[PDB]
Design a binder for these strands. Structure first.
Lengths: 205, 143, 63, 40, 125, 28, 11, 256, 50, 49, 39, 47, 150, 22, 91, 63
RNA sequence: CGGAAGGGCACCACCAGGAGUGGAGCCUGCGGCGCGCUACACUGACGGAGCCAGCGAGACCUUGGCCGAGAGGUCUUGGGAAACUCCGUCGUGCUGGGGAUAGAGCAUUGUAAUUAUUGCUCUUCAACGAGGAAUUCCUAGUAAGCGCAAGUCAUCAGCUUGCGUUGAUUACGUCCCUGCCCUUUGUACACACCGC
């Protein structure tokens, strides 16, 4: 659903065809194209804003499309899925070109440098890998497994260390100098790393 | 400290052992070594007619010892390359079993190998020891 | 695209033309949004070179 | 003797002409199955 | 018992089992020292991980690689991938993950296909 | 058998996953 | 037949 | 994902069995239907909504005539993309197709520059028909004949009677693109005569009194001889139907 | 008949593509002014095709 | 028959030339066991097979 | 520069080649014709 | 193609004109094939 | 994978690009090992002849031999003429490599020399700007045509 | 050679016989 | 159908949708009680996150994406038997 | 001959130019002000460097 | 019925290149048209050496033993490819690239007509010197090279279809040309944009 915030009212209700639930969202910088990634279809549905009727279904993952975002300078989108994979689409101007990168395990969170050159993807091993887009290569990753304060459950039979209950980060975001990362998950900790030197600056409980 | 052809290269070992067999002399080469053809798929006899039989013998010893027991048919299968029938496409051709068996009988007469149950051709203990000796020789060949 | 394509010398001629209309006020009021849009976009594109140049008559034109 | 499968037909002027007249009757009627868009 | 880790490398249709155990520092492939890989121009293509990371690690570590399937080139790439993966696995399991991360960073900086396979899945326009 | 192999489900868990010539016969 | 922009510089 | 495929193929087979039973019950009920006084499943799911996309690909190492014929078939269909196959195995080929999102596939086999077989496979583990195509004549074979009109075409289907005819008709119909214009120019004719369905393009203009047609496109006679339920990689999917050659009544029975 | 070489070779066009590197290209024109062949050849350069 | 695969067979010793076979092509051939058939194409190198 | 003579328009060679080419010709022709008639 | 057909019909014994348009714009027709099938029918009926 | 996006060629290492371009002809396709052998012998020969550095020689030759202007074929509605335009750096590099490779193959096609040594001669003369190499000659011809009908 | 030629003539005779049949 | 809704929605259908039963038909554990013991010991995961309480009805898609947690003795032994263990993933 | 260097600043689209040839605006590397509209032949992208034999001429369309 | 303007798409178009057919030999489908395979060598040929795959599972294969240059035959057992790479010979000559054809000899197959077919060996060394006019096809494990296996109701046995191996150069832009297609009631819903 597309809302204003000056009149405070829906523009529009984009939807698919089979009433399919949408896990993640991303929007073009020009505010002209809307992309939504489901979990029952793993096709990135793409609607137009002014027209309303969905352009198309970017397909090519297998397994649910975990997250999306747009590089707001080259205006591309990275879409990451439990296919252990990232997929960088350019969807403007005659080409419709794709670029698939592989990670070691199920990506499940993604964010993008504000300048628009790198992606940061958190996978299920708890390593925040960081990729350069145009080169489609790995600039560097940050381990996170040990600096996470999970929590025990009173109905559990095991410990709060040797369980992978929340040993990973389901939410990443950059800073606006592009130098720092905030991370948070199903765990009890919010960890603040920094990119260019691959370490953590802080951890809040 | 105990080496083998598993630790030595192939071509250098084959050349060194062929030279050793040349110098040793007692190999009992056949009389028609200089006319025989080495393959029906080949089209001219080996160039180095003086010791190609010795090179074949050394390569046979290396093959048997890298393996454990091999028949003359297995040797022929291993050695026989593909031909060129011309306008029609090519097809696989076996080697010269006759030469393979004079090699095999010569190695038995020398004593490098011994016979092998289940039918077959195995390496003898003394031949194995001499093979290790020559392998160490060509390893420390670098002085 | 046309305003991007046209080269800097023609941009300079363009500014002379705009000054001419400002002298001929009535056209300006007839087509005020159009001329404003074109002038502003052309400057926003060729800013670096325009300010880099020095020309007192150009200062007067712009004023 | 006896064959064992239908012989592949040979296209001749007669049969192609019958075919073309049949097409013409169809489209003159404008009756011809397509894949119509689903409504609603 | 003895520390041992086992990894797999895979090029086009080449598989490479890499066994790593704590040992005197020998690298054997198919029962032969690594210095005798076949194509002999890609000897350095397979020497890559050793000269990328250094050798004292290999001086403490013992390595055994068995290859089967694929061509010459595919087998070579499988071998190098198997060695790289196995080395990092061992450093992860028996020594500091600090050095684990330094190794992984150096490998991925040089050439990432040392670690993650390049599954060339097709593209229809 | 081919259908079963195509649907192996590569994660199944059974529990048992945790396990002269006359002279040589006589000795063995 | 010229192009828009092209006609512009001409005029 | 492989588990997705397993579950989805099993449910697809279940659905097809239920549809067959319901078809037999409908045939029974037809007697009552005349006393008092519909599309198939995949195509019902995606009938008029999504326009099909096809990949038309050669067998393997195609001779230039086979490549010519593949390009001709592409020009015939709308929403077609041609594919040259070199060193694609069938599993990864169809996997790329499903993953990429493709209604369907058409793989052509020829005998020394003379096409003879044509396989049409529907990818959401739908059916694959194997036709034998005989009397081919290509535009490259003919002459510089101008260019294919490439507009969305009208369709003609003639003398498809039994349920088998209906099955083949729905397959071909949903290969083609949906919802043409009223004055849509070119029309694809699928005649049937003794099991040899023959196809031709025709452009036309409604003349001052009637119509006149210029015949264009390829010209060939193509006859089904297999229709497997699964997809073409499988080769062990149950056969919905099967042409029998060596039956007593071979040279007379139609639609079998 | 000597079976040594092809003598009359129909070659793929054109003349420039099957022509030497450094050349002077003239056409016989009746209305063109009269020139002297020997002086023309001598006044041409040293490594050229005419 | 002298060379058989699954469902295909090379039959010798039944005609005397390729022209003969080509005249007879497309025939309901059946064997003693009672399995039907047809003769598909006249084989080339041997004269009648 | 030595001149050369071009030919334009072995005996048993040409005769066997002619006979074989002929035989190929009527053989292929007769196979074609018989097959058409049988069909 | 279609352009040529439309121009021809706009330019244009009406039945004969239609017939000649027929026979010239059907560009896939074995005239020797037709005569062959004729002579084969004749041979069959004579047989 | 250097053929997916648009300038991964620009990110390729120059030597591998050279060897790939070398392994290009009907009987040459798909023998990269042999191409590597050829490039190795060529580098050795370059050092033997001129002592400086094979790779520096290669780079110098490429930079010197890439063309700089070129003429497209303007139809003009039938009055076919040539118009002079500039050329992008990636095209310059592609054409420099192509000229060198074709030059070596051409000069060793039917000749007692072999491809390795002929490539060494080509590269050395190209670094010299000798104007006796196929590559430099062709570059000069292209640029001269551009100069003429600019 | 001669056998080839005479069997060739015999087969041409066979051809014309088939056509006088047909 | 709707009469389907009025008739075949059963405690049997819900209980066969129950997770350990899903494990059994999908063949995680050979028995229901072994499945429940594994859920207690914390070895299964559905999508990202793992599951501790057996009375967990698994949605269609999720039950399709069930499998083990990583680095568990159970998966280690499975792969050991297959001789496909791969310590890089610390399987 | 004295050649000059330039840096591409913008590729100019939608101008109707002959296939293979592309419009482009460059600003000289030496002095960052002055800019010329040139044509290029190969694949060109923004912010790369390009060699000019001429500075004076400015490209026109190529039909 | 026609015209204008705007926008999109395409290896039937532009642009960059690659690879063919067409020349010769061979095979063979349509009746002159067309498709395959082998050549024209030095990125080779030749000789020694090195070895790296995958699909395939309804008197037969065979491991091993014995002789024979080879082909092959004889005695016993049960129901691992080429291209490739390492050294060595050859050098630019239709020469060692090319093996047509011819002659002779040696064995196998049926059978009896001194019948035919197959394989090996010697000697004989033709055309072919990179293929005009034209013309088609092509964008990533793609062009192209190399071998292997099966004949699973159609089609195929000098051939179809699979599988493995080696693996590029050049576009990845543009509507300028050649076409083809769409639009000229925003219809829908803010903001902006546009306004017969």
């Amino acid at each position: 659903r597309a809302w204003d915030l000056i009149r405070y009212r829906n523009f529009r209700t984009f939807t698919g065809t089979e009433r399919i639930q949408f896990n993640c969202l991303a929007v073009d910088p020009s505010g002209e194209v809307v992309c939504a990634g489901s979990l029952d279809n793993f096709d990135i549905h793409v609607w137009s804003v002014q027209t309303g009727q969905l352009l198309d279904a970017l397909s090519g993952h297998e397994g649910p499309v975990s997250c999306l975002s747009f590089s707001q300078e080259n205006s591309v989108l990275a879409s990451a899925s439990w296919d252990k994979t990232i997929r960088i689409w350019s969807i403007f101007g005659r080409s419709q070109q794709v670029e698939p990168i592989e990670v070691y395990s199920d990506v499940l969170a993604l964010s993008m440098r504000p300048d628009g050159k790198e992606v940061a993807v958190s996978t299920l091993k708890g390593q925040i890998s960081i990729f350069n887009i145009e080169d489609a290569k790995q600039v560097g990753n940050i381990d996170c497994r040990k600096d996470i304060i999970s929590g025990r459950f009173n109905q559990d039979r095991f410990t709060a260390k040797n369980s992978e209950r929340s040993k990973f980060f389901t939410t990443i975001h950059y800073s606006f100098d592009g130098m720092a990362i905030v991370a948070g998950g199903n765990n009890n900790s919010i960890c603040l790393y920094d990119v260019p030197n691959e370490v953590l600056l802080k951890r809040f409980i | 400290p105990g080496v083998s052809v598993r630790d030595v290269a192939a071509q250098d070992f084959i050349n060194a052992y062929a030279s050793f067999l040349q110098r040793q002399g007692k190999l009992e080469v056949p009389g028609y070594v200089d006319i025989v053809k080495t393959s029906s798929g080949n089209e001219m006899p080996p160039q180095d007619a003086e010791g190609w039989f010795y090179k074949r013998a050394a390569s046979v010893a290396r093959h048997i010892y890298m393996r454990k027991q091999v028949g003359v048919g297995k040797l022929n299968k291993l050695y026989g390359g593909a031909k060129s029938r011309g306008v029609r496409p090519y097809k696989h051709i076996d080697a010269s079993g006759s030469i393979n068996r004079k090699v095999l009988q010569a190695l038995e007469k020398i004593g490098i190998v011994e016979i092998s149950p289940k039918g077959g051709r195995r390496i003898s203990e003394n031949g194995q020891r001499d093979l290790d000796r020559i392998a160490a020789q060509t390893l420390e060949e670098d002085e | 695209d046309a305003l991007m394509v046209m080269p800097f010398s023609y941009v300079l001629k363009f500014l002379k033309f705009i000054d001419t209309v400002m002298q001929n006020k009535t056209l300006l009021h007839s087509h005020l949004p159009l001329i404003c849009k074109n002038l502003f976009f052309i400057i926003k594109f060729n800013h670096k070179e325009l300010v880099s140049q020095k020309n007192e008559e150009l200062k007067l034109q712009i004023n | 003797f006896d064959r064992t499968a239908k012989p592949v037909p040979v296209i001749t002027s007669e049969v192609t002409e019958s075919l073309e007249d049949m097409i013409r009757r169809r489209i003159q009627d404008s009756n011809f199955d397509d894949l119509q868009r689903r409504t609603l | 018992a003895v520390p041992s880790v086992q990894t797999f490398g895979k090029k086009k249709s080449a598989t490479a089992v890499a066994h790593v155990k704590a040992g005197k520092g020998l690298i054997k492939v198919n029962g032969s020292p690594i210095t005798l890989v076949e194509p002999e121009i890609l000897r350095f293509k397979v020497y890559e991980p050793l000269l990328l990371v250094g050798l004292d690690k290999f001086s403490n570590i013992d390595i055994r690689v068995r290859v089967t399937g694929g061509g010459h080139v595919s087998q070579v790439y499988a071998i190098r991938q198997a060695i790289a993966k196995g080395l990092v696995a061992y450093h992860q399991k028996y020594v500091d993950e600090q050095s684990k991360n330094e190794l992984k960073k150096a490998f991925t900086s040089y050439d990432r296909t040392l670690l993650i396979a390049d599954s060339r899945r097709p593209e229809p326009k | 058998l081919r259908e079963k192999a195509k649907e192996r489900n590569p994660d199944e868990y059974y529990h048992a996953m945790h396990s002269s010539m006359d002279q040589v016969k006589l000795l063995k | 037949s010229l192009k828009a922009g092209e006609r512009l510089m001409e005029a | 994902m492989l588990r997705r495929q397993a579950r989805e193929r099993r449910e697809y087979l279940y659905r097809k069995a239920q549809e067959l039973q319901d078809s037999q019950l409908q045939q029974k009920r037809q007697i009552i239907k005349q006393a008092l006084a519909q599309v198939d499943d995949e195509y019902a799911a995606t009938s008029g909504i999504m326009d099909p996309r096809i990949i038309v690909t050669t067998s393997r190492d195609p001779s230039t005539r086979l490549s010519q014929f593949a390009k001709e078939i592409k020009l015939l269909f709308p929403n077609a993309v041609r594919l040259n196959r070199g060193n694609y195995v069938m599993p990864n080929l169809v996997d790329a197709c499903k993953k990429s999102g493709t209604t369907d596939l058409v793989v052509l086999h020829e005998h020394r520059g003379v096409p003879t077989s044509l396989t049409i496979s529907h990818f959401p583990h739908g059916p694959t028909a194997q036709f034998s195509l005989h009397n081919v004549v290509m535009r490259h074979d003919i002459i510089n004949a101008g260019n294919q009109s490439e507009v969305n075409p009208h369709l003609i289907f003639d003398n498809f009677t039994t349920a088998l005819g209906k099955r083949v008709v729905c397959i071909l119909k949903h290969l083609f693109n949906a919802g043409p214009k009223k004055d849509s120019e070119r029309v694809i004719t699928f005649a049937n005569r003794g099991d040899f369905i023959s196809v031709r393009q025709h452009v036309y203009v409604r003349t001052r009194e009637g119509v006149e047609i210029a015949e264009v496109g390829p010209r060939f006679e193509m006859r089904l001889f297999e229709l497997r339920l699964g997809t073409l990689e499988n080769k062990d999917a149950d056969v919905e139907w099967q042409l029998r050659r060596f039956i007593r009544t071979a040279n007379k029975k139609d639609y079998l | 008949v000597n079976s040594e070489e092809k003598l009359l070779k129909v070659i793929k066009n054109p003349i420039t593509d099957h022509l030497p590197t450094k050349c002077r290209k003239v056409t016989l024109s009746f209305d063109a002014p009269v020139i002297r062949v020997q002086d023309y050849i001598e006044k041409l350069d040293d490594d050229e095709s005419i | 028959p002298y060379k058989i695969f699954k469902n295909t067979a090379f039959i010798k010793d039944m005609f005397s030339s390729a022209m003969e076979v080509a005249r007879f092509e497309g025939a309901q051939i059946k064997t003693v066991s009672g399995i039907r058939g047809e003769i598909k194409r006249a084989l080339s190198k041997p004269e009648g097979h | 520069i030595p001149t050369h003579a071009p030919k334009y328009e072995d005996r048993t060679r040409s005769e066997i080649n002619k006979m074989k080419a002929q035989l190929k010709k009527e053989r292929k022709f007769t196979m074609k014709e018989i097959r058409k008639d049988a069909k | 193609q279609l352009k040529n057909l439309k121009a021809a019909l706009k330019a244009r014994e009406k039945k004969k004109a239609i017939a000649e348009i027929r026979e010239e714009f059907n560009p896939f027709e074995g005239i020797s094939k037709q005569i062959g099938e004729e002579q084969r029918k004749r041979a069959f009926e004579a047989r | 994978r250097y053929a997916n996006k648009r300038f991964r060629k620009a990110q390729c290492p120059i030597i591998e690009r050279l060897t790939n371009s070398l392994m290009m002809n009907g009987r040459n396709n798909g023998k990269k090992l042999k191409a590597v052998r050829i490039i190795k012998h060529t580098l050795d020969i370059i050092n033997v002849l001129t002592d400086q550095n094979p790779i520096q020689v290669v780079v110098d030759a490429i930079t010197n031999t890439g063309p700089r202007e070129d003429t497209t074929r303007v139809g003009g509605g039938g009055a076919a003429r040539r118009q002079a335009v500039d050329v992008s750096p990636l095209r310059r590099v592609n054409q420099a490599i192509a000229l060198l490779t074709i030059g070596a193959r051409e000069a060793a096609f039917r000749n007692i020399k072999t491809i390795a040594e002929t490539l060494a001669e080509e590269l050395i003369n190209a670094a010299k700007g000798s104007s006796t190499s196929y590559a430099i000659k062709k570059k000069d011809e292209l640029e001269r045509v551009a100069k003429s009908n600019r | 050679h001669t056998l080839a030629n005479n069997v060739e003539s015999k087969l041409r005779d066979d051809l014309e016989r088939l056509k006088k049949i047909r | 159908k709707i009469s389907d809704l009025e008739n075949k929605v059963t405690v049997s259908a819900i209980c066969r949708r129950r997770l350990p039963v899903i494990m059994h038909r999908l063949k995680m554990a050979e028995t229901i009680q072994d499945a429940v013991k594994f859920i207690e010991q914390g070895h299964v995961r559905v999508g990202p996150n793992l599951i501790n309480d057996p009375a967990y009805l698994v949605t269609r898609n999720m039950e399709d994406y069930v499998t083990w947690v990583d680095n568990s003795k159970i998966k280690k032994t499975l792969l050991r038997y297959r001789n496909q263990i791969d310590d890089f993933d610390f399987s | 001959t004295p050649v000059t260097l330039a840096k591409v600043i913008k590729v100019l689209g939608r101008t109707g130019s002959r296939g293979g040839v592309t419009q482009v605006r460059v600003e000289f590397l030496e002095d960052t002000s002055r800019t010329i509209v040139r044509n290029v032949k190969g694949p060109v992208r923004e912010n790369d460097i390009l060699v000019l034999m001429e500075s004076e001429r400015e490209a026109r369309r190529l039909r």
